[PDB]
């Protein structure tokens, strides 16, 4: 528009709202659960989920989804987050690594075993 104006205020683009704030470009963080909560899915898109508030070390609780199917999580239970989000569960924005720390792999998935970090079979 004008120069005039431009010289006074610079243009301004957005500053992105960080979807997480497990931050300090968190790769991963240990957290510790709280308990393993449970909550409903979304209005049409419906599934139960094993999720859990997590007592992260940087200090921010938040409930994570517990991936896959199989399980091993208590109330008190050091755990490791990753981001994520169950696009059908509000409040999820994470994802606790399966196979990490306080869990190993679930039983016998075969496909994509890295997701749900599982060994290689006996071959």
């Amino acid at each position: 528009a004008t120069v005039n104006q431009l010289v006074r205020k610079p243009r301004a683009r957005k500053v992105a709202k960080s979807n997480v704030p497990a931050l300090e470009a968190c790769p991963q963080k240990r957290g510790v659960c709280t308990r393993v909560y449970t909550t409903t899915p979304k209005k049409p898109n419906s599934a139960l989920r094993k999720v859990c508030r997590v007592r992260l070390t940087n200090g921010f609780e938040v409930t994570s989804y517990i991936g896959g199917e199989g399980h091993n999580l208590q109330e008190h239970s050091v755990i490791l987050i990753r981001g994520g989000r169950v696009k059908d569960l509000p409040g999820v924005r994470y994802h606790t690594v399966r196979g990490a720390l306080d869990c190993s792999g679930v039983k016998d998935r075969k496909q994509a075993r890295s997701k749900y970090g599982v060994k290689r079979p006996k071959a």
Binding site: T38, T40, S46, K50
Partner: protein, 323 residues
């Protein structure tokens, strides 16, 4: 929603119950053994269910459940064993066939059963400020149609006086004349709490009244522990348990027993008394109004049939076509 897909689906859910009951460990691991329960509280998306053990569990309700409501006793699970123990964690795997239950009328939104497994439905009511037999009249038909027992309870009697009661009790005598059950009392005052207590003895029933009839007083009067707030001014699906046995589905609505339209020939069956007023009339199709030689009319203006009952019965039929 698919009546067909709904059907085939029904069978599946049904088998799931019996199959799960067959025995457990094959089911297992996330959740624990199935057990019976009834629905006390409705969390919209959750439900509080009291177990056989007698400990309530807030549970999820698998989509596979078309619906659920208060007064629904049936099978259930909580998550695991471990999981109930930190924080009420459970889920409702399936439900049972509501043996006895009732629904609300509505306008757009269709009829929805309010509660199931009911032995008696005590109509509340209150003298403050003023009653309207109409609300009770319409309710009487409901109790007959679901083949439930009705108890009318004129409450808050302590609020009446000389020229206040002499017109209350008598005016209600109609119920004592046609064989209905009633017990004047006043929650605030705890009067006639003996008769009711006995009546509720070994029975499965609940109390619902119109706008502000002392429902909170009576439910809180019989048995009230850590929770006596449901009075207070003029204002407002959980079926609470009784002190002497029996449960009462309280949701903030039920007490306002509206009136839904079931059939046009049933209205005549609503009241047993009609069993003698529908014998021989003037017109084979005499709707009992301004016909020449009617039977119900010749009885009403004759002193036997309570006029008030006529106006109310006639209004009910005119209320349905109000759609």
């Amino acid at each position: 929603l698919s009546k067909g897909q709904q059907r085939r689906v029904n069978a599946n859910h049904q088998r799931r119950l019996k199959t799960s009951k067959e025995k457990p460990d094959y089911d297992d691991n996330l959740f624990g053994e199935p057990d019976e329960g009834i629905v006390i509280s409705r969390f919209g998306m959750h439900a509080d269910v009291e177990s056989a053990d007698g400990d309530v569990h807030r549970c999820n309700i698998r989509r596979t459940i078309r619906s659920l409501v208060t007064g629904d006793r049936v099978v259930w699970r909580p998550g695991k064993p471990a999981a109930e123990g930190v924080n009420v964690k459970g889920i409702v795997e399936a439900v049972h066939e509501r043996t006895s239950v009732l629904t609300r009328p509505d306008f757009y939104d269709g009829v929805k059963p309010i509660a199931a497994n009911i032995d008696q439905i005590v109509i509340v009511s209150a003298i403050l400020p003023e009653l309207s037999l109409n609300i009770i009249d319409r309710y009487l038909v409901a109790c007959e149609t679901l083949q439930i027992e009705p108890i009318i309870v004129l409450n808050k009697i302590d609020l009446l006086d000389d020229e206040g009661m002499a017109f209350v009790n008598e005016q209600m005598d109609i119920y004592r004349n046609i064989g209905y059950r009633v017990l004047m009392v006043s929650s605030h005052t705890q009067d006639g709490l003996k008769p009711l207590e006995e009546a509720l003895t070994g029975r499965i029933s609940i109390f619902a009244g119109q706008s502000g009839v002392g429902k909170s007083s009576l439910l809180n009067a019989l048995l009230g522990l850590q929770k006596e707030i449901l009075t207070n001014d003029i204002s407002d699906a959980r079926l609470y348990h009784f002190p002497h046995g029996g449960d009462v589905i309280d949701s903030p609505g039920v007490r306002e027993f509206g009136l839904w339209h079931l059939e046009p020939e049933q209205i005549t069956q609503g009241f047993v008394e009609f069993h003698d007023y529908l014998g021989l009339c003037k017109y084979r199709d005499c709707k009992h109004d301004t016909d020449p030689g009617c039977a119900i009319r010749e009885a009403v203006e004759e002193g036997k049939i309570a006029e008030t009952r006529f106006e109310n019965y006639h209004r009910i039929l005119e209320s349905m076509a109000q759609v």
